[PDB]
Design a protein around this ligand. Structure first.
Ligand SMILES: C/C=C(/C)C(=O)O[C@H]1C(C)=C2[C@H]([C@@H]1OC(=O)CCCCCCC)[C@@](C)(OC(C)=O)C[C@H](OC(=O)CCC)[C@@]1(O)[C@H]2OC(=O)[C@@]1(C)O
Ligand SMILES: CC(=O)C1=C(O)N2[C@@H](C1=O)[C@@H]1c3c[nH]c4cccc(c34)C[C@@H]1C2(C)C
Length: 994
């Protein structure tokens, strides 16, 4: 295991004492394999076994409803009254709901694809090595590859480990490093040491990274690291070391879970404490085990009254219909709970290229030297029209079309852009528009050369297929490109060594053609081209050039600029060695500046507006970009991250500037920063940590395994649809169209969805408060059992379950994106809303109890004993207050219960309407604003008749409440809940909140 791309090929061999020709000996292999382990990432042990479910049952509010399932089964055996076989469905239904909420609850197929898993895809099964025990090329399990052993790689091979290149057997080695970046265009390798101990992967020109694959050639190298110690394995570990917090809702539901369990077993002691009657009253009779069955009866009644069963199903359905909706709008949300955290997003860090912009480069402006007289110099400047890749548009001067070949320097400008170029252009016959073949910046030039028709080639008589590369071809006819010196970040340029195709125009020797970032290229220009003449570089000249470059890059029209120059008399062909990449810069020396091109990658049509939408939503937007700081700040102005003229010093940092900052100062930079330029390997991940340190819900965009730890880390990882397999799985959302506005649009959707959830979560539990407050009263201060569990199970699944789902379809609030993001710790119910629900639960608690008790005092048709005082006695062993009459069964009658259910169903219908809004009256924000709710109100009441009339069903429940006088009291006991809430709903006029 070496730490060196920075060492000579000798040094690495000597490190492990291997011979390049023999490789590692069988003993070395053994020694090494023990020191370093196998070439593999650890196995993941959280697999698909039933552990899923036994966990699902491990929860409190599941265990509590399971203990009450066992109690229900023991009770469904010992029976009196009519000894009917139908009451066996009672302990059977809970078990079914405990299964249905488990199966659907344990839906970790959405989480079956975890990002660390996806990382095995890039370790191959096979690798080839040159051990000492065979002179041949043993092809072994990649697993058994050790650091120090001499490896072989050829075209098509996935690189088996992090390898220090030793010898390139083919004329050139190209590797595809997309898994890292996403940046398809393959890179050239070399053998020379990269002497900076802290070189980033991009710049490790002599290394092959495990999991990467070879595009062209054959090379022999020495394995340096394996297992978790390769680049890819280091990314694995960071991902393993980050743990996900639970979504702020999931957290509340657990907190509500715990606090419910507390209230449940705080009533059980109160019931016992209120029942110091049985402990002193019933002298004898064997009621010690016959009366302890009564507490077990109210137990299962207390549980189901509190547990808001089916809420799982409601929230799950609501979210599932959220995912479908978001997809139509190009936001693919991998994980269901995400649609909530999405709603809370307070910061978006977005890559510029292809997300904030279109990634469609076109050259707009270009200049060359006009005249250089002493200390004054003028330039010739030109615009170019049309932003597409079509060779369709014009060069113009002073806003008027001109002919580029009339300018000697434009000729050479075009020569360089066509020769110093690895791309080209292709007319897609099928779609009917042209196409880049390669890097976009490079194609922008090809298109340019196509528009400047310097040699005046006839084009209007040409096929739209030939047309594509017509003029470039003419320039290739003119100069034979021998070799080419690749780009490198170290010198920020690229040249091309060219010879004259023996046409004999400018037949004065070979020529290198240099194009690169303006600073470096210009610094290596001793000369300036002026038409065809050449004059020494001077301060005034260099000032003029740089002055305009600065204008174009930082001005309103934001142009990335390339300087182009040529080496008039390049070093001898033989005297150059093309293998020495650090030697490339000195070959590009004694240049003659020729011209500059300024190209644009336009801000996507919708960003300007979307960013404004974020301003209003109180969402920070942070641009991460490869632009130089100057242009970063400019582009930011252009798209409205910064005011057209505002102060921005401390607000935008280069990656280097960030690095110079002490930790604390770095942290403080992130709570303010809106633009990061030329950010490094670590940075995204650091940016996310700091943002989180200020309690910010963070959206972060990225691609590649490079960006996976950041996407894991961020509350919202965001991959591009065109992105790698791994970035995709690491993300919490995929953007199908790569557009920025899809994030912003997905945020609005999440705020919309959550708002209704708040309402339907609150409504559904609001019912349970009532049920408990009811069941308590019908146990302690009174005995006449008002509601039985079975009824409540059907109430909490269907009668409330439909309006609950309908609230899921509530009409989106009108000002969502004009209020700031929701606090994650903001509780759904406290303050005034607690007392509000504390009263509604209480009211209904006294309504269903009151309508069960009213059955005694008033009821005309059917049993009606005025002031019967069922609170007095329930056992019926005496029958002395009742002198002579067979009556002791009206106690467990299927009629006074049908009163309560009819009330409960009806109040929840009003409380469903009540729950359309939080604050606005139903006369301000009407019940007819939600057509699906009315549709549910109808269906809810309709199915209530069904289980009351069609006989099989009113057997497990009760008997029909025929009378209209009986249904009149139902409405007269239930409908005033609208009135109570309404008073409280708008007491907020006084309570100065809204
Ligand atoms: C299911 C029915 C009930 C009555 C249950 O106790 O819910 C309580 C409870 C656990 C909470 C309360 C209920 O508190 C009470 O009702 C007081 C007890 C009075 C009962 C009468 C005595 C016999 C919720 C339901 O209702 C009221 C009346 O305000 C609101 C909210 O719950 C939520 O917001 C859930 C969101 C995930 C929680 O106070 C919550 O505990 C929390 O941690 C919270 C903050 O969440
Ligand atoms: C409010 C609240 O926290 C909860 C809920 O409201 N539900 C779920 C739950 O925990 C429980 C649910 C999740 N997973 C399973 C598996 C099996 C059975 C259940 C569940 C029922 C639980 C219920 C209904 C209490």
């Amino acid at each position: 295991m070496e730490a060196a791309h920075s060492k000579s090929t000798e040094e690495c061999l000597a490190y492990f004492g291997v011979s390049e020709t023999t490789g590692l000996t069988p003993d070395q292999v053994k020694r090494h394999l023990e020191k370093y382990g196998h070439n593999e990432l650890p196995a993941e042990e959280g697999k698909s076994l039933w552990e899923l479910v036994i966990e699902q049952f491990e929860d409190l509010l599941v265990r509590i409803l399971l203990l009450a399932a066992c109690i229900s089964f023991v009770l469904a055996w010992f029976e009196e009254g009519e000894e009917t076989i139908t009451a066996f469905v009672e302990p059977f239904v809970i078990l079914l709901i405990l299964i249905a909420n488990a199966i659907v609850g344990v839906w970790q197929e959405r989480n079956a694809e975890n990002a660390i898993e996806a990382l095995k895809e890039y370790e191959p099964e096979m690798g080839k090595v040159y051990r000492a025990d065979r002179k041949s090329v043993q092809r072994i399990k990649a697993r058994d590859i050790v650091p120090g052993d001499i490896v072989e790689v050829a075209v098509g091979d996935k690189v088996p480990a992090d390898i220090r290149i030793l010898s390139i057997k083919s004329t050139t080695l190209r590797v595809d490093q997309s898994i890292l970046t996403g940046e398809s265009v393959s890179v050239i390798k070399h053998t020379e040491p990269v002497p900076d101990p802290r070189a980033v992967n991009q710049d490790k020109k002599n290394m092959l990274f495990s999991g990467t694959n070879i595009a062209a050639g054959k090379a022999l190298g020495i394995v340096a690291t394996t297992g978790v110690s390769t680049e890819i394995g280091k990314i694995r570990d960071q991902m393993a070391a980050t743990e996900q917090d639970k979504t702020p809702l999931q957290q509340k539901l657990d907190e509500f879970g715990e606090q419910l369990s507390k209230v449940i077993s705080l009533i059980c002691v109160a019931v016992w404490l209120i029942n110091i009657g049985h402990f002193n009253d019933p002298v004898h009779g064997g009621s010690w085990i016959r009366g302890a069955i009564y507490y077990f009866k109210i137990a299962v009644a207390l549980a189901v009254a509190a547990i808001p069963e089916g809420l799982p199903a409601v929230i799950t359905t609501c979210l599932a219909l959220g995912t479908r909706r978001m997809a139509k709008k190009n936001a693919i949300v991998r994980s269901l709970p995400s649609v909530e955290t999405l709603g809370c997003t307070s910061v978006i860090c977005s890559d510029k290229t292809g997300t904030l912009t279109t990634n469609q480069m076109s050259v707009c402006k270009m200049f060359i030297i006009d005249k250089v007289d002493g200390d004054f110099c003028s330039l010739n400047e030109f615009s170019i029209t049309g932003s597409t890749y079509a060779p369709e548009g014009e060069v113009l001067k002073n806003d008027k079309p001109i002919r580029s070949g009339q300018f000697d320097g434009l000729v050479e400008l075009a020569t360089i852009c066509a020769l110093c170029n690895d791309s080209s252009l292709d007319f897609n016959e099928t779609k009917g528009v042209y196409e880049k073949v390669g890097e976009a910046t490079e194609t922008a030039l090809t298109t340019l050369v196509e528009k400047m028709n310097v040699f005046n080639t006839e084009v209007r008589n040409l096929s739209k297929v030939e047309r594509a590369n017509a003029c470039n071809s003419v320039i290739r006819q003119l100069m034979k490109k021998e070799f080419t010196l690749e780009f490198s970040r170290d010198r920020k340029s690229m040249s091309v060594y060219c010879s004259p195709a023996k046409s004999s125009r400018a037949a004065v020797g070979n020529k290198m053609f240099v194009k690169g970032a303006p600073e470096g290229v210009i610094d290596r220009c001793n000369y300036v081209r002026v038409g065809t003449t050449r004059v020494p570089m001077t301060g005034p000249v260099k000032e003029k050039i740089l002055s305009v470059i600065k204008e174009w890059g930082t001005g309103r029209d934001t142009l990335r600029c390339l300087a182009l120059a040529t080496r008039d008399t390049p070093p001898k062909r033989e005297e150059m060695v093309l293998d020495d990449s650090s030697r490339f810069m000195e070959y590009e020396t004694d240049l003659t500046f020729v011209g500059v091109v300024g190209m644009l990658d336009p801000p996507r049509k919708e960003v300007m507006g979307s960013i404004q939408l974020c301003r209003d939503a109180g969402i920070r937007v942070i641009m991460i970009t490869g632009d130089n700081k100057g242009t970063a700040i400019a582009i930011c102005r252009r798209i409205g991250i910064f005011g057209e003229n505002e102060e921005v010093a401390d607000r935008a940092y280069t990656g280097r500037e960030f690095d110079d900052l002490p930790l604390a100062e770095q942290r403080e930079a992130c709570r303010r920063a809106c633009c990061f330029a030329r950010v490094e390997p670590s940075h995204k991940s650091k940016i996310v940590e700091y943002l989180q340190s200020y309690d910010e819900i963070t959206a972060m965009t990225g691609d590649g395994v490079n960006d996976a730890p950041a996407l894991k880390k961020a509350e919202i990882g965001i991959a591009m649809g065109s992105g790698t397999a791994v970035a995709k799985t690491a993300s919490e959302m995929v953007l199908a169209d790569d557009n920025f506005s899809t994030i912003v649009a997905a945020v609005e959707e999440g705020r919309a969805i959550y708002n209704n959830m708040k309402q339907f979560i609150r409504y559904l539990i609001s019912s349970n408060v009532g049920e408990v407050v009811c069941i308590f009263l019908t146990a302690a201060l009174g005995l006449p059992e008002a509601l039985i569990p079975v009824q409540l199970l059907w109430v909490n699944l269907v009668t409330d379950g439909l309006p609950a789902t309908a609230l899921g379809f509530n009409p989106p609030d009108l000002d969502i994106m004009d209020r700031p993001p929701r606090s994650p710790k903001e509780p759904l119910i406290s303050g005034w809303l607690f007392f509000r629900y504390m009263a509604i639960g209480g009211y209904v608690g006294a309504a269903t109890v009151g309508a069960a008790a009213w059955w005694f005092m008033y009821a005309e048709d059917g049993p009606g004993v005025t002031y019967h005082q069922l609170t007095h006695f329930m056992q019926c062993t005496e029958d002395h207050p009742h002198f002579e009459g067979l009556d002791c069964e009206i106690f467990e009658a299927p009629e006074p219960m049908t009163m309560a259910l009819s009330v409960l169903v009806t109040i929840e219908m009003c409380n469903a309407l009540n729950s359309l809004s939080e604050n606005q009256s139903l006369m301000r924000m009407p019940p007819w604003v939600n057509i699906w709710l009315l549709g549910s109100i109808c269906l809810s009441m309709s199915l209530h008749f069904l289980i009351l009339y069609v006989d099989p069903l009113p057997m497990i429940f009760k008997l029909k409440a025929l009378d209209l006088t009986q249904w009149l009291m139902v409405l007269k006991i239930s409908l005033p809940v609208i009135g109570l809430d309404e008073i409280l709903k708008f007491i907020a006029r006084n309570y100065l909140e809204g």
